[PDB]
Design an enzyme around this catalytic site. Sequence first.
Site, mmCIF file in Angstrom:
data_model
loop_
_atom_site.group_PDB
_atom_site.id
_atom_site.type_symbol
_atom_site.label_atom_id
_atom_site.label_comp_id
_atom_site.label_asym_id
_atom_site.label_seq_id
_atom_site.Cartn_x
_atom_site.Cartn_y
_atom_site.Cartn_z
ATOM 1 N N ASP A 25 0.821 -1.215 0.000
ATOM 2 C CA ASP A 25 0.000 0.000 0.000
ATOM 3 C C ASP A 25 0.850 1.259 0.000
ATOM 4 O OD1 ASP A 25 -1.905 1.869 0.527
ATOM 5 O OD2 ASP A 25 -2.896 0.900 2.179
ATOM 6 N N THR A 26 1.166 1.768 -1.192
ATOM 7 C CA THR A 26 2.024 2.941 -1.370
ATOM 8 C C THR A 26 1.337 4.152 -0.758
ATOM 9 O OG1 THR A 26 1.193 3.322 -3.601
ATOM 10 C CG2 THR A 26 3.234 2.085 -3.425
ATOM 11 N N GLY A 27 0.032 4.101 -0.547
ATOM 12 C CA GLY A 27 -0.682 5.178 0.082
ATOM 13 C C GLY A 27 -0.710 5.127 1.593
#
Lengths: 99, 99
Positions: A25-27
């Site tokens: 999850d790059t967010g």
Amino acid sequence: PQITLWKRPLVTIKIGGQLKEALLDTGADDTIIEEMSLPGRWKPKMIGGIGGFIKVRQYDQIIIEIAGHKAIGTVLVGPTPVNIIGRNLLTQIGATLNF
Amino acid sequence: PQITLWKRPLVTIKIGGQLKEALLDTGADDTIIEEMSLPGRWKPKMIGGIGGFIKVRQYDQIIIEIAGHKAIGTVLVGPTPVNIIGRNLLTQIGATLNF
Ligand SMILES: CC(C)CN(C[C@@H](O)[C@H](Cc1ccccc1)NC(=O)O[C@H]1CO[C@H]2OCC[C@H]21)S(=O)(=O)c1ccc(N)cc1
Ligand SMILES: CC(C)CN(C[C@@H](O)[C@H](Cc1ccccc1)NC(=O)O[C@H]1CO[C@H]2OCC[C@H]21)S(=O)(=O)c1ccc(N)cc1
Ligand SMILES: [Cl-]
Ligand SMILES: [Cl-]
Ligand SMILES: [Cl-]
């Protein structure tokens, strides 16, 4: 690997003797999972999401295998609807987002 | 580009002829933009994450430019604290996670 995004980028993770899976999850600034076996005392922490803010359990110096790559760092335990590997550990495994 | 993850992976976007910035979020199934005007009919939806669910308007077949790359697809509008480009549009620009 070079992972496309047509489905969720779930990977095998390992903590202690527990094999789980989690969403890359790059967010997410931080890693959160729902449960860890017999992990001892935590420190309280607050974090935000889209719906508001949740209380989580902070554990430091956790040894975690992520898609076959070793990382050591902070893992939060809390009411996340899906286990997430956030940027604190993505950087340790050398993950980049490319286009 | 190749984007490392020591900071949030924010990029320039253009939507509605307006320049904005948004988070490239492999953990987000679908794209969610803060309140703005978009063309066409919308449908009411809800989305969920940490802290629960929010109400959003779903607009279909919206043009967007993500870091200079055109994509067309569904855009949700609602009370997110950050503009988020989710997998439904990341796939359109061929974004991958690499490690
Ligand atoms: C929790 C995920 C399974 C889903 N979320 C995407 C996620 O990347 C968000 C995206 C995000 C980012 C910032 C603020 C809100 C939401 N990050 C997030 O909640 O991270 C939390 C853990 O690390 C902290 O750092 C950021 C907030 C904390 S989500 O924003 O709820 C979401 C859910 C559904 C859609 N279609 C789009 C977005
Ligand atoms: C992204 C929002 C615009 C979504 N809306 C949610 C709604 O509750 C908003 C949520 C809301 C709240 C404050 C500001 C903007 C939007 N309220 C709203 O539009 O209130 C209007 C009535 O009073 C006016 O002053 C506020 C805006 C106007 S909504 O389109 O009606 C709708 C309703 C139900 C769902 N599931 C999905 C969408
Ligand atoms: Cl597949
Ligand atoms: Cl894997
Ligand atoms: Cl214990």
